[PDB]
Amino acid sequence: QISVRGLAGVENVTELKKNFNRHLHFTLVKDRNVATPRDYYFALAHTVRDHLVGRWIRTQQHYYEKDPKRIYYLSLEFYMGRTLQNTMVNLALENACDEATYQLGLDMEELEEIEEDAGLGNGGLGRLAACFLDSMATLGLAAYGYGIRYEFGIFNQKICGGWQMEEADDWLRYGNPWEKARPEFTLPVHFYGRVEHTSQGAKWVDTQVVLAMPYDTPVPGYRNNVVNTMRLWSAKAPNDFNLGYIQAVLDRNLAENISRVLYPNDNFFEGKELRLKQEYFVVAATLQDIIRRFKSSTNFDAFPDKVAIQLNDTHPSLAIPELMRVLVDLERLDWDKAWEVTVKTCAYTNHTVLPEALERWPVHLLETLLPRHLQIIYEINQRFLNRVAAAFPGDVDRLRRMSLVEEGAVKRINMAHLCIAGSHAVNGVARIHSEILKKTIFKDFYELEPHKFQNKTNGITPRRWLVLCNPGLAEIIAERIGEEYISDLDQLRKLLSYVDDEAFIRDVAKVKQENKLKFAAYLEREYKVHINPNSLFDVQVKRIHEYKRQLLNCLHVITLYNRIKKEPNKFVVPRTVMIGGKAAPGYHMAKMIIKLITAIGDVVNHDPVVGDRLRVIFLENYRVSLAEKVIPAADLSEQISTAGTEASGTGNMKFMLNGALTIGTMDGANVEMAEEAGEENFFIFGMRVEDVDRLDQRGYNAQEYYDRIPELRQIIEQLSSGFFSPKQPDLFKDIVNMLMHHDRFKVFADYEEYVKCQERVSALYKNPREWTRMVIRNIATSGKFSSDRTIAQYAREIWGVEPSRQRLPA
Amino acid sequence: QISVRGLAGVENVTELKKNFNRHLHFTLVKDRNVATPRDYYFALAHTVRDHLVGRWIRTQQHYYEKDPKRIYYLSLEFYMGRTLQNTMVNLALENACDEATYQLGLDMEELEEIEEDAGLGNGGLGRLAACFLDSMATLGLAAYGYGIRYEFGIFNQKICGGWQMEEADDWLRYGNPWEKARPEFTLPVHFYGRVEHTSQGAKWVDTQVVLAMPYDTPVPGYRNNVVNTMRLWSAKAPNDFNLGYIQAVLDRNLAENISRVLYPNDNFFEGKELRLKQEYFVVAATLQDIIRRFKSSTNFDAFPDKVAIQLNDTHPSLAIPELMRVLVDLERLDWDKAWEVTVKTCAYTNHTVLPEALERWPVHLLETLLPRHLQIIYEINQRFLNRVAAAFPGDVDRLRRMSLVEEGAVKRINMAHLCIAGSHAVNGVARIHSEILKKTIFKDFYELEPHKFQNKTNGITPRRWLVLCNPGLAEIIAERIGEEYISDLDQLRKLLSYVDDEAFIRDVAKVKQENKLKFAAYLEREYKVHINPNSLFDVQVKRIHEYKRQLLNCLHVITLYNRIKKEPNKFVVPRTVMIGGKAAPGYHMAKMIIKLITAIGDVVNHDPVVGDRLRVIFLENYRVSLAEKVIPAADLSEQISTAGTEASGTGNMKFMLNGALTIGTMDGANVEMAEEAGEENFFIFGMRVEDVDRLDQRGYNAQEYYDRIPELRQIIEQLSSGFFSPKQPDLFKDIVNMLMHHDRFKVFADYEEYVKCQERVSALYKNPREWTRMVIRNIATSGKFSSDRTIAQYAREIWGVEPSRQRLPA
Ligand SMILES: OC[C@H]1O[C@@H](c2nnc(-c3ccccc3)[nH]2)[C@H](O)[C@@H](O)[C@@H]1O
Ligand SMILES: OC[C@H]1O[C@@H](c2nnc(-c3ccccc3)[nH]2)[C@H](O)[C@@H](O)[C@@H]1O
Ligand SMILES: *Cc1c(COP(=O)(O)O)cnc(C)c1O
């Protein structure tokens, strides 16, 4: 059908059809008369997977032969989503498979909808890791993603009576055709025990052993025949574990619980023992695998020339003391040499400045679980603080501020400080965030070692986030500038010369309109909900958090509602306001916010005076596969965190690539997006970081806004009085109390400007041609936000390797 | 190479080779330069499995079309062993695969040794189920085996310092290529809850739900293209189970523990809740599947014409009240009609008369776990006892003896009584056992319903237990009488006309000698143990139990040792005495017996005066794959249980088929074996059942034997004094005390006759030609003990279906 989707040659189509029937028969053990759509999905998945394995084997053979520097990306989260369509896109097989399945009497889109998301992440950090893997393969890097194979990923969200309920995400129930178990490369990981000092160094003994079994998933580059590996570890008990007899076998679950479930917190630290075990488990198994591969080429001098380890936040920070442990205790390098190697190997990426998100582990935990690592951390701290004291003599407060050990009620280890000390590079994830790190929380470290600190602005992969989810848009773009932009996103600037082209203006707008129709039909089909497809689709999809300010959006929605009720017969630009995202199960305020959103919907959506001029929909179970549907359908992207809180954001970039305009604060990557497109082509409002700091110095008093803004006071009175909860008038008292007395994110302070800016949005939407022209200017300048750009910078500035766009042979 | 192993045609060999390379590449994702022998094993297994699926699909299609009566064999145990060689044998692929692998540079035997046993059974009962499945497929019956897919089967036995240690049998670690998960046919099973009575009958409510997920394994018939199904259930938690959040996910293990581990008791009842859950789980999932299949053809009148359910002992006895539950509560049949259907559908097989093995469940357990089933059982009991009272008026003691409810300290349900009441046929497993049932423990039931009681003497499959494990013997036999005997074992009688044939005598003896050499080499290779291959191989392999009297064997071994030490320069027929088998982990006396065996070995094997005239070897980790090695190598089969205790035995039959002579008591199937071969061709000794009864009436006094038999007294003094445990002189005090004061199995009473009979064995072994002639007479009359004969009798006399030897089309 469409050009970007590749060739459908007779030979290939014939071959695909026979391999599909072969898998249906021999692999699935079904005949056509009993096969369900799920059986068909699996036959297709195995058929496409067969095309990966050849290139996978020869890629890994190639790295063995040529022995390039290897990049190891260590993350506790990989939010992969679905694999089938991505694999087809990257192998140029989509049209052929479409043809082959069509000829067998099947709709491929329908089969694609059967695949479960691999939901092994919470949101942006996990999804960034997934985008990065795709870019690293596309750029020809010898890269491996290492993580944990959770049996249960991020929970499935149901809404019952307006409240979030959580269900286990049993994503492996029907099997995962993409992975390959590798039980032959199982590795032991140690816990507990004690340290023994001998004539010849320390020994960690009397440990409990848990086995780490790997599962490998292929990661195909874009049409270059590179297939890299994501290796995920699964916990297994040894066979003599606890070895009355029956109970000892049942107690194997204790050991195997390490890989059972993903902690469902986004931007929050929960200091539980099981989480610490997960962090050490991934680190200890991964480092043995790295060292094995390195030896299979005594001289650890060359280790940093052949290995880079990238720490995705502090979650795998134990890599630093584990590497020292291995080098000093097992390989018997002297301390100084070991530390040099470690520092040159490791680099650390920070993704947040929120204090409740920073990992600070109680010493008593590490002492019990990882007694040798604690000794090593203490030794690192002592030597690091000696360097500080020599650079800043007599500055005793600096010593206590920079220490890896925090004193207080309970002593804790600051994992961010450990990561800075033991890494040759530290980066933030957008220019403003990186500056904030140097100015505030890591200021002392920056003064000591300015050369360590860098920026690497985040990006998203244009394979998944344009070609795959928005083929219509990719096509009309390819018609004008060709296909090269898919792996060189800066070529989208060529689109600026079509900004006055009436044909292009029309096609851009038609593609959006079709995306909106298809999403509106999705809603009815799957959720019995009826929306006006001519309305402005105003969307805020991201995890539920106070700092992301879903509440500020809610205040606007109610304002629109009240203005309609005040002047019902006055014209307003119709909107469909969509908000979605998951709340962490223990985050009470987030759960209340969800309930508020549905409650506003209950009132607004059933008010005859409103009509279809305003609809408020809570999008259930937001996840990668839903993002690929709603993002191409959006007109307005809500990126409204308090300035200084959203380290980067990545949803923002997805919307910009897909033809939505952005309303947002000058926060995270929003600043660079506005800079790339021009501020005139962005709806910017609110306090800058400097204004927030000024307000904090003065003292934020919310009462003042309530007193001076009647529209705001009215909303608060509606909330308190039970207008949105008739049967339980005090239901939202916690929300009102927070907004009025302890709002850390200053919702009221940005209200007036937000509402005004939203009026300017409605004004522009009334003039379709000018809206579309501004859209074209956004799409055209979105190139900087390709993760290919991001990974090229990591590669050159941190890892010391050159990317390559050269194909390997097929 | 050999004829019985099938054709190695150029086309087939070429095809096998390409499919092997295809699986190595696409299935295993390996290249030849990294592949290990395990990868090669898996490539072969997938290649052979491909040849099954076609016939599997068309067999099951065929049963759908023709709708024959279906046979459901319900067992908690299926002791399958290895699958690869069996599958090749049954498909006529062995020589082709041998050729194909040879041409790829691989030894197929070596690859066969990599496969794990499926050890989902304890011993004879589980292995009988496996033999039965093979025969039912070979005889063309529409049969399904239903059980539990245990994650851990029977434990791996290690011997440390002469003591048994248990290790978990993680048999699924590397994957199981033979099974196919069928998550689409997952079924709910209910536990706990309470019963509600309405206007319209009882309702079982507030239950906890556990899901039953099936896994299907193919069961190929012998060269008839029939492939039947063994469906094994795995426990899964529902996704809203327990649904703070993390703990709720981790607590899914509670539900999933049901299918975690096989209870490792042979002939012993352990009344634990988890075991009861396993029993109900298999029954409840299986019966829904049966009823689904029956409806997919309102009229339950025809249910017994289309369904037979065979209960493998009482372990699945809850099928009876579950069937009533479904018919009465869900389908709303009246009680009397439901009971008629149930009785005509169910048949019960008893496998033991040992009182400690009989299942008697505490009412309080059933009351909590299965409250509706308890109500149904009470109702069955009341109506059954009304029939008893009407047939035997005023016989109040009969009423209490026959009740399903046992009164006492705790009230219990007698599951054997439930099974007799609710089955149209009840059988024992050898003629003497079946008579014992009618005379003793089920006498009252036999008087009430004599027509129910039958015999079905056990058998073993001659595919696994001759062709597969002893190809050399199968060949020399096929040279004379052709190949038809493999599926018509009675044809072995034709061998009686070769009893005076000097060529045949020589070939039989050479085959044995080669089996012995190959087993002696196995021992060195794998266990650094050096044995004389010219010695008589005297073997006792079976589970360790007091009733099997491994101790009587030990007493003989020590007698031989003492006689040598008394007259060292006198000639004796050299023996290698081999004893193997597992002890249940909680069975203290069994564990002591193992230690005694190794301790005797420690003394005997290192005594220079003995030389290589006597060796005592404990065979570690006895299991199906070890049985296939040691049984073809044996000269003497020890079948020495106390008369009346071994219901049948099946090991006995395996040895007879493979050219060993038997020393044994008149117990179980030994009686029929002696009858078939002629008593002159059997080494029978000891009390008959009648003599045991006489001794029990008088009172067994062990002291009397000790007083009158000096050789016995000497052994007991050696045991007590620490001769076999120098460092711990009192180590075997428990054993001595049991033998002297509370030996339920009368070891001393058979000692004199056992020793005398063993002298007659040694005398015959000194004359090779006459030994071999007696062997030929055993092999030639072993035909009755084919499980094909057994299953034909079940089919005609219990299930009401005719077997067929007709092939389906390939
Ligand atoms: O750089 C990728 C994205 O990381 C997110 C993030 N920052 N910290 C976490 C986090 C912290 C603890 C647990 C799980 C996730 N997630 C940030 O909040 C986003 O601004 C950013 O785009
Ligand atoms: O008929 C097959 C074989 O069943 C065995 C047997 N009888 N009861 C059990 C049993 C009882 C409880 C748990 C596990 C197995 N096993 C008998 O002891 C054997 O004589 C018999 O050959
Ligand atoms: C991109 C993405 C996110 C991150 O969105 P932000 O708006 O940057 O928080 C979270 N969840 C999913 C499923 C995504 O695809």
Ligand SMILES: *Cc1c(COP(=O)(O)O)cnc(C)c1O
């Ligand atoms: C046949 C067999 C048994 C049963 O042997 P008996 O001597 O009848 O108890 C037990 N275990 C295994 C592994 C077998 O093959």
